[PDB]
Design a protein around this ligand. Structure first.
Ligand SMILES: OC[C@@H]1O[C@@H](O)[C@H](O)[C@H]1O
Ligand SMILES: OC[C@@H]1O[C@@H](O)[C@H](O)[C@H]1O
Ligand SMILES: OC[C@@H]1O[C@@H](O)[C@H](O)[C@H]1O
Ligand SMILES: OC[C@@H]1O[C@@H](O)[C@H](O)[C@H]1O
Ligand SMILES: OC[C@@H]1O[C@@H](O)[C@H](O)[C@H]1O
Ligand SMILES: OC[C@@H]1O[C@@H](O)[C@H](O)[C@H]1O
Ligand SMILES: OC[C@@H]1O[C@@H](O)[C@H](O)[C@H]1O
Ligand SMILES: OC[C@@H]1O[C@@H](O)[C@H](O)[C@H]1O
Ligand SMILES: OC[C@@H]1O[C@@H](O)[C@H](O)[C@H]1O
Ligand SMILES: OC[C@@H]1O[C@@H](O)[C@H](O)[C@H]1O
Ligand SMILES: OC[C@@H]1O[C@@H](O)[C@H](O)[C@H]1O
Ligand SMILES: OC[C@@H]1O[C@@H](O)[C@H](O)[C@H]1O
Ligand SMILES: OC[C@@H]1O[C@@H](O)[C@H](O)[C@H]1O
Lengths: 481, 482, 112
């Protein structure tokens, strides 16, 4: 009833490196007090929190999304460039804060270079214009003599930033968004912005706004599916119950398959190979204010491990994903003036991203399954999932072919699971198992106790067949050879 | 590389018995000269062709759809009831033929009763009205003193017919349909007709029209997803090329998953458990006239075996399917005045429905796969399929738990496959393999040679592990006592 | 009659009109009713006039005295359907769709 079979010689498909993306919005203390804090003793002279930097570098961010989120739909990017003391203070409608614009495009790009991430910029389609977006693109990517390319040089960067990922609006369907649009308006607008941005720089990838309204999605695909590269999906989940939280990995799975099928049903989109960008996702159900400082526990970190494992298996369909968000706001990392906490959501990335290959290999998993009905998100919406596995895994190998990584999530709350594992043609060797778990499903890290939830390692002896006991509510990578 | 592991003690889900249903339209010689031929030396006292009747009983039809198809969207069911001599001759717009109406509701129900099939009636939403559909339903199902219930009694049938399946229109999106509608029109009308019909008889199942247009499907699910029970899907396929034909089993599979996910995306539909009725499907690509006598070959019968195995594994999403059509028109069975021909499409049904269980059990298949880019249907539309298997299987067990059926399709065009099969906890014993096969991919049965493509039986010995050599382009059922 | 507010006895009808046409040597040109009429009703008029087979309305023309088809060549698909004075008047989109529908099925029955 439980077992795992891996064939390292059978490569199924690449795993897109962008599944491990992140997102920082100008919301609460995400940016100001989070990644950035002028005159914190913990910041360098650019204002970057150095302790945050060290934690972000450790999870090897492939791409970073900015600046929103709801914020970008009332953000004018030119307010954020040039001599800092000359930048206007603006009232942000989305989260109802004064915004000083001291963190703006050039500082965001500097932050990306620092951490090694590809910038992923979202444009303003609420109060912004086509010209305004093309100017932002020209500023970042232009290598000619246009005014905004010159302006980037004048402000201290001769070389183009080459921003590759551009988000065509944020959540333009929602009544909460400034300048929100109907399906027809947004679909025509997404086609218009995308096609002209691509006339200026044909190398960019454009992410168009998707949601759960299947008519919305289809209008977007029908109208813009000849020029866009992704349609985005946002997924937020969770409740006080353990199984109700972690099972929604498998709800997310069905949601994604649905969006994929929509793409399949629009010839031009199916033919260009439009894909999905899961560009916002996390647990989010406890907090509902303008700071969103959700206190993640181990339960939430197991959900996060389950998503990363899922994306390794589905990255051909969903090559771009971005946890919402990096710091403080729905934060993987929580900061205080005098330190930081690494939540179990952070730990999920610290585990998977440091123990994972570039190619997915044939993995066949035997598992008991369960059915569940629960609630999710801040409004406690009911959902159900059928046949969610208690045990799930994905095996990957490194580019060179020297290392095998078997990630295993044991969702069982109540019991450890002894699992026979088979690996075809594997010698008999030593391997390290890295395990994320904690003392109970509501365990948390604090300033006082920063490692209640942490990754432990043990050496084990491995063969073509072997068994391993996986603790309850845990995720482990068996790193071999 | 190729292998099959079955666990007969792990029951995955039931297999809906309605996946093997059939469809007879008033099209060309499907009815007149097909199932029904008044005065033929081959017909009984009701005018039913007896040779056809024997062939239809052999495939254990679980439900039979009638009378269309494009036909029904200009059919007035009252034209086909009462003393046959007084039924009016009509010009059928769909297929441009005079319809004498000598085969109508009472004859159809009698036909269904004779073959043991549940009737499935489509209603006319092209030229018909709400009243007219209500009256048809009252005639068939009314147990009271209403005019139409009394009329059914008067014409010789006191007991109500209890027709369970009702088709809410046919292909109402297509410009070829008489009275075709926009999506918003049809979605509102489907809601209106279904809801009042269920006020008269809450026990019926309503099938609403779906297609390949996702906006159409979603209007229908959004507007009527609170009252309909199924959304229908039609699937026609085929080309001259062997792989282009059989691989579209797997195009269908993705089309179905598509429509299922549309249902998932409409909360009222999803919560009501709205399913798919694949209520027309076949190979159709050679003939384009008003008679549609598509000359099915073995390649086409292999596509059909592939669909039935697929439906065994997906019947929880697609519990109702109907091959189009039973006789002559896209015909599984082809008739002439002096006999009939069983096509390999008919043989697919002969094989699977006689050798299959009621519950699907755990079946893991190893198979090499292939990708293809082809054309399909009379207009040769391009399609592509990714990772179609060369080998597929579904294992099922009988209701009592005492017979195992392992259906296996070898799609390879040229080579036999010796496949290792494991059945968990099986003793060593004898079993029978029933195999639908023929000499080449284009083989056909004829009047002169009715058995070129047919089902063979042989004893083999099985055990917990055994092997069997499966002919190329063949389907087999290994039937085992447990 | 709603259009001219008169009692219409119908003592002059299709058969008398055709007979009048044959008397004067004119091709009949018949306008159909798209106000209170239906597609079936138009098709039945056409079948009565032009059918040469065994359809109910062809037989009906024979029963009333005229075994040979009338072969009416000109059919008016509606009259002034845009006008508010017309019974059952239509918008452009409604009339356009209906004209296509009536015309195409009438021509399936008689393509001449
Ligand atoms: O991540 C918080 C908010 O979630 C989504 O509703 C918005 O795009 C973002 O501003
Ligand atoms: O803000 C998170 C939201 O919950 C869903 O309704 C919104 O569309 C999704 O983006
Ligand atoms: O109820 C709204 C919830 O917000 C979204 O992320 C969840 O998917 C949606 O179901
Ligand atoms: O094969 C299972 C799912 O159905 C397909 O359409 C999706 O691409 C895939 O992830
Ligand atoms: O498993 C833990 C990760 O692997 C190491 O390289 C990272 O620094 C460490 O945190
Ligand atoms: O501690 C875990 C770190 O990640 C591993 O890859 C490093 O070698 C190991 O020391
Ligand atoms: O739910 C599907 C049903 O399961 C079987 O028991 C019935 O015969 C079949 O029609
Ligand atoms: O079965 C042939 C025709 O195919 C479909 O187009 C129609 O519903 C049916 O009349
Ligand atoms: O008649 C078969 C047809 O080809 C497809 O476009 C139609 O919708 C389908 O019903
Ligand atoms: O021309 C298209 C073919 O008719 C339909 O049945 C096929 O599915 C459709 O793709
Ligand atoms: O047939 C099983 C299909 O696989 C999944 O991708 C769909 O949700 C489910 O209907
Ligand atoms: O395998 C063929 C079928 O099994 C027997 O009952 C059927 O009559 C026979 O034709
Ligand atoms: O002939 C094959 C028929 O199918 C079986 O069930 C019958 O016994 C067998 O004779």
């Amino acid at each position: 009833s439980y077992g795992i079979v891996v064939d390292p010689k059978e490569v199924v498909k690449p795993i897109s490196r962008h599944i491990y993306g992140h997102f920082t919005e100008h919301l609460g203390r995400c940016i100001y007090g989070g990644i950035y804090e002028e005159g914190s003793p913990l910041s360098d002279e650019r204002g970057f929190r150095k302790d945050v930097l060290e934690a972000v570098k450790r999870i090897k961010v492939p791409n970073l999304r900015w600046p929103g989120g709801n914020f970008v739909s009332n953000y004018h990017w030119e307010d954020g460039i040039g001599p800092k003391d000359q930048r206007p203070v603006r009232f942000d409608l989305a989260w109802q804060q004064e915004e000083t614009n001291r963190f703006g495009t050039d500082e965001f790009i500097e932050y990306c270079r620092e951490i090694g991430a590809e910038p992923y910029i979202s444009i303003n389609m609420g109060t912004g214009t086509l010209d305004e977006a093309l100017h932002w693109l020209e500023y970042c990517n232009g290598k000619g003599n246009t005014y905004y390319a010159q302006l980037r040089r004048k402000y201290g960067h001769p070389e183009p930033y080459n921003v590759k990922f551009w988000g065509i609006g944020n959540e333009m369907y929602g009544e909460w968004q400034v300048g929100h649009m109907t399906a027809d308006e947004y679909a025509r607008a997404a086609k218009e912005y995308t096609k002209w941005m691509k006339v200026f720089d044909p190398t960019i990838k454009a992410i168009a706004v998707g949601c759960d309204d299947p008519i919305w999605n289809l209008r977007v695909l029908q109208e813009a599916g000849d020029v866009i590269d992704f349609i985005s999906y946002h997924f937020y989940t969770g409740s006080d119950d353990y199984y109700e939280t972690v099972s929604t990995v498998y709800l997310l799975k069905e949601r994604l398959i649905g969006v994929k099928k929509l793409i399949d049903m629009v010839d031009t989109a199916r033919k260009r190979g439009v894909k999905i960008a899961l560009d916002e996702w996390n647990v989010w159900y406890r907090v509902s204010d303008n700071k969103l400082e959700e206190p993640y526990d181990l339960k939430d970190g197991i959900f996060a491990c389950g998503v990363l494992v899922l994306l390794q298996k589905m990255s051909d369909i969903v090559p771009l994903a971005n946890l919402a968000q990096l710091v403080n706001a729905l934060g993987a990392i929580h900061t205080e003036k005098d330190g930081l906490i690494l939540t179990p959501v952070y730990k999920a990335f610290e585990l998977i991203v440091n123990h994972s290959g570039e190619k997915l290999v044939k993995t066949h998993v035997e598992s008991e399954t369960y059915n569940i009905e629960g609630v999710m998100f801040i409004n406690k919406m009911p959902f159900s999932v059928e046949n969610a596995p208690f045990l799930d895994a994905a095996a990957s190998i490194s580019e060179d072919g020297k290392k095998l990584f078997i990630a295993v999530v044991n969702y069982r709350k109540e019991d450890a699971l002894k699992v026979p594992i088979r690996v075809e043609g594997l010698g008999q060797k030593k391997a390290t198992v890295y395990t994320l778990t904690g003392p109970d499903v509501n365990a948390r890290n604090t300033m006082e106790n920063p490692n209640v939830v942490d990754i432990t390692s043990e050496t084990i002896t491995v063969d073509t067949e072997f068994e391993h006991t996986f603790k309850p509510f845990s995720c482990s990578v068996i790193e071999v050879e």
